[PDB]
Amino acid sequence: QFGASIQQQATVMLKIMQDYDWHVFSLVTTIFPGYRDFISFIKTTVDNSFVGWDMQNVITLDTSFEDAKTQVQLKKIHSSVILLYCSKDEAVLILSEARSLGLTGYDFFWIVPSLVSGNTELIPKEFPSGLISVSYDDWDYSLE
Amino acid sequence: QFGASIQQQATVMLKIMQDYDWHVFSLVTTIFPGYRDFISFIKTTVDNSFVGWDMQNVITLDTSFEDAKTQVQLKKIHSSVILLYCSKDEAVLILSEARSLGLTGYDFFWIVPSLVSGNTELIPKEFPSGLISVSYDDWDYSLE
Amino acid sequence: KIVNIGAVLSTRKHEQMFREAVNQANKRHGSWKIQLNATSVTHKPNAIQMALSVCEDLISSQVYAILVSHPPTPNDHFTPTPVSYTAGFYRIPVLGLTTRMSIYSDKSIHLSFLRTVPPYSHQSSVWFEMMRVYNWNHIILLVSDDHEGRAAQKRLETLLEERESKAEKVLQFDPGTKNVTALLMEARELEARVIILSASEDDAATVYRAAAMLNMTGSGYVWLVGEREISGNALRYAPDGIIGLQLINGKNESAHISDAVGVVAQAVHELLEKENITDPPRGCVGNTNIWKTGPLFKRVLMSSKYADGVTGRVEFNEDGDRKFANYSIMNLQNRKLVQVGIYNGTHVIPNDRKIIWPGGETEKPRGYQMSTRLKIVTIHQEPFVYVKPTMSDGTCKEEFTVNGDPVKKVICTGPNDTSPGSPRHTVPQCCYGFCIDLLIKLARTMNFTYEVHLVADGKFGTQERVNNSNKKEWNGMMGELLSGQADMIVAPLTINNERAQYIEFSKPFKYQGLTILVKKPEERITGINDPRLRNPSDKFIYATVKQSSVDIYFRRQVELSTMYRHMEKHNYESAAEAIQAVRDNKLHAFIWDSAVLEFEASQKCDLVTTGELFFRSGFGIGMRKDSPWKQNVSLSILKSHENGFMEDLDKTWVRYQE
């Protein structure tokens, strides 16, 4: 194939966070596979950075949420930048739960990977206007 | 009457909260009557105490909860000590929603008055084991 | 298949109208097999046996709705309470129709009471609509009925929660007395003229006579009353031009009965469409089991929404009150009731008739007149507030300074000594000095008179527990200012964060720090960083003025609790006591402001200050809350800052040495 990997995309997103000095952040991971490599890559990137990042503990989901034990970990979130790694189906429920929590504020940023960013036409109403996404979908360079 | 009013009982409960340094707390008031006097007495007692109480804003109710607009006010709660003034049949639904939203943790406290705590025999299973109550029902002093 | 309705009604014509409304209630509801029976009872002049007859007759009848419809009762108690209490024993809704007392608003007391009339506190919201129209902020409350007084205060604080303003004066007392004119004169000395009254007819007529004898009904005096205050001899004692309220169809019983029949009938036909039907048992003999669908039928009555009636959109709130009520606004023009406004549920519209006021023009009188004589209180500051006894009788010896400046004194009033020393000795003497000349400059800039008096003690004022009910109170200059007896504290006020939360501050005129007074081996201390003062003993005797703001500033310091425990055994009343004590070589250190001890070192060479300069702060003028005496006064202070008038005040006392 072509393009970047999920590790190079994570490097680009941490470069975005480095260029804006958003050093206080968090990390929320679901049960989508390839997640422990993602967490370990974030840990080795923070360990290989000139920043000294303020990383909150990883909020790990288990199943479809009862909104009883996951809410305890969601109320621990006092940082600004919220890092979410999930699929498109669970992202609607996560953003709706965060909107019900009031954790979708002006300082509460949301940066998502490329695979959760699905169809350009199909956009659910639960997306915050200002949702940061990174993908290789370039319209200036066509297929030819 | 040979009894103990709700104002002196609120004084005793705030004395308990002062003796435990439980200064960060909240207040949930339903549509059970005699509630604005309770809020005003709490406001005057906080304004006339050496603590300087860190009081979260009052979660108010209008009817039986839709779990749509009251859900936002309950998700604003992140403090430990929770005060409540309601009836027993309302308190069953309140504790059911609090268990459904995970507000019955080890950090979170629950202090109720004597009017919501009715018969000693009739105890439903939805009550958290550790529910703080203050009642003047002394079994050592009989009616005679 | 039957529904019984109980009623306490007197006149046979309205009983026939009630039975006709019951008969016409089953007209448009089809040919359904439900039946409606009505049982009406008369009235015996007593109240215990009336309650007995009505309660056992409605137990034997097993009714669902209980109605009391007697306005013109000769007894002024107006109590349908025992039948409502007996129905609340089985949780049966009693629909009260006549009275508007706030004791019925408590659903904890009246468990199953509903009504279609609001209490009078909602009229205050209509009066808050006056605040939405006439743009008036400061009010004067006067409530005699203490059963509704707490509810009126609650509703007033609920209305003032939006604008976040404060009522200037509230009053609650026992109805029946007559010598309330002292508090009326105390409200007359205030800036506002808004008069809110909530009492019966007798106290309203009493305060009308009190305002008529003292002429408190002149120009600009805002009067705003209700329906209870425009009846009886209070209507005879009312001044011309007073604005009152009128309940539209408040006493018109005939349409009100039909409205109640429609409400009860649609509530019953709504309840018939649901399950869990229960019936009231024969509770007179051997039945104490409660009616289980009490709160269920109450919840049915909560969401009751209607569209029929001459009055209009009758609707219950969470308190079961009346929504969207047409009110009238009346005026008393030459002992004649003249309608000057109408009111829908949200908005006031005046009619084509004019609004003639008891004062001057037909427009609104702005009854917010600021105090042209500002009551000035101060403490006896030694280089700033010089107080001299009079020569012969209330006079001031006009002595001249060495720089050709005549001392412009003022006749101030002050106590003699402390309260164990002097029981009651308060004389007028001559006050002059620094802040007196500052007030002379303020009176030269802006034209306003003043009234200089003195604080009763030698303390600034601290936040202390009062000896009952665990309540915070202030004292001193703050205690005399917040009580309304003072207007402007002209004193070197120590600016801190605690007092900024309670009152508003002006710009500081003085800028200085703190220092140590010693007498002249290390004879100097060089500030707080002396390790021997960290762990003191009986040798280094250091203290401060009792109940001073320096002690509060050290109380915020959570790392110097040892000095807070040490200085509490030697706190003096005034700073001059500390000057006299260190003059006799009994003290050793004293934390105090800089330039005062610099002036005292210029007076006495043995008084030596320390070298360090910490707590570099400023002293300004003690002020009230949001007030028009803030911006212009602060601009005058800044005008005094920009020119050489600060240097002139230095030439008077600061730059002058010996």
UniProtKB/Swiss-Prot annotation, chains A, B:
Effect of residue 119 to W: Nearly abolishes inhibition by Zn(2+)
Consequence when changing residue 88 to A/R: Nearly abolishes inhibition by Zn(2+)
Residues bound to Zn(2+): 121, 137
Tissues in which the UniProt entry reports expression: Detected in brain cortex, olfactory bulb, hippocampus including the dentate gyrus, striatum, thalamus, superior colliculus, inferior colliculus, midbrain and cerebellum (at protein level). Detected in brain cortex, hypothalamus and cerebellum.
Subcellular location: Cell projection, Dendritic spine; Cell membrane; Synapse; Postsynaptic cell membrane
Role description: Component of N-methyl-D-aspartate (NMDA) receptors (NMDARs) that function as heterotetrameric, ligand-gated cation channels with high calcium permeability and voltage-dependent block by Mg(2+). NMDARs participate in synaptic plasticity for learning and memory formation by contributing to the slow phase of excitatory postsynaptic current, long-term synaptic potentiation, and learning.
Family that this chain belongs to: Belongs to the glutamate-gated ion channel (TC 1.A.10.1) family. NR2A/GRIN2A subfamily.
Subunit comment: Heterotetramer. Forms heterotetrameric channels composed of two GluN1/zeta subunits (GRIN1), and two identical GluN2/epsilon subunits (GRIN2A, GRIN2B, GRIN2C or GRIN2D) or GluN3 subunits (GRIN3A or GRIN3B) (in vitro). Can also form heterotetrameric channels that contain at least two GluN1 subunits and at least two different GluN2 subunits (or a combination of one GluN2 and one GluN3 subunits) (in vitro). In vivo, the subunit composition may depend on the expression levels of the different subunits. Found in a complex with GRIN1, GRIN3A and PPP2CB. Found in a complex with GRIN1 and GRIN3B.
Domain remark in the UniProt entry: Contains an N-terminal domain, a ligand-binding domain and a transmembrane domain. Agonist binding to the extracellular ligand-binding domains triggers channel gating. A hydrophobic region that gives rise to the prediction of a transmembrane span does not cross the membrane, but is part of a discontinuously helical region that dips into the membrane and is probably part of the pore and of the selectivity filter.
Name the record gives this protein: Glutamate receptor ionotropic, NMDA 2A
UniProt organism field: Rattus norvegicus
Residues of the full protein shown: 146 to 289 of 1464
Curated annotation (Swiss-Prot), chain C:
Cysteines paired by S-S bonds: 55-284, 396-430, 412-431
Domain of life of the organism encoding this protein: Eukaryota
Entry keyword set: Calcium, Cell membrane, Disulfide bond, Glycoprotein, Ion channel, Ion transport, Ligand-gated ion channel, Magnesium, Membrane, Metal-binding, Phosphoprotein, Postsynaptic cell membrane, Receptor, Signal, Synapse, Transmembrane, Transmembrane helix, Transport, Zinc
Topological domains annotated Extracellular: 1-520, 521-658
Binding, glycine: 492, 494, 499, 549, 593
Catalytic activity: Ca(2+)(in) = Ca(2+)(out); Na(+)(in) = Na(+)(out); K(+)(in) = K(+)(out)
Topology in membrane: Multi-pass membrane protein
Activity control summary: NMDA glutamate receptor activity is potentiated by Zn2(+) in a dose-dependent fashion. The potentiating effect of Zn2(+) is at submicromolar concentrations and its inhibitory action is at high micromolar to millimolar concentrations. Excitatory glycine receptors are inhibited by D-serine at 100uM.
GO terms under cellular component: cell surface; cytoplasm; dendrite; dendrite membrane; dendritic branch; dendritic spine; endoplasmic reticulum; endoplasmic reticulum membrane
Transport found in the keyword field: yes
Tissues in which the UniProt entry reports expression: Detected throughout the brain, in brain cortex, cerebellum, thalamus and olfactory bulb.
Glycosylation: residue positions: 37, 179, 215, 252, 276, 326, 344, 416, 447, 467, 535, 632
Entry note about domains: A hydrophobic region that gives rise to the prediction of a transmembrane span does not cross the membrane, but is part of a discontinuously helical region that dips into the membrane and is probably part of the pore and of the selectivity filter.
Protein's job: Component of N-methyl-D-aspartate (NMDA) receptors (NMDARs) that function as heterotetrameric, ligand-gated cation channels with high calcium permeability and voltage-dependent block by Mg(2+). NMDARs participate in synaptic plasticity for learning and memory formation by contributing to the long-term potentiation (LTP). Channel activation requires binding of the neurotransmitter L-glutamate to the GluN2 subunit, glycine or D-serine binding to the GluN1 subunit, plus membrane depolarization to eliminate channel inhibition by Mg(2+).
Protein's name in the database: Glutamate receptor ionotropic, NMDA 1
Organism expressing this protein natively: Rattus norvegicus (Rat)
Covered range of the whole protein: 25 to 797 of 938
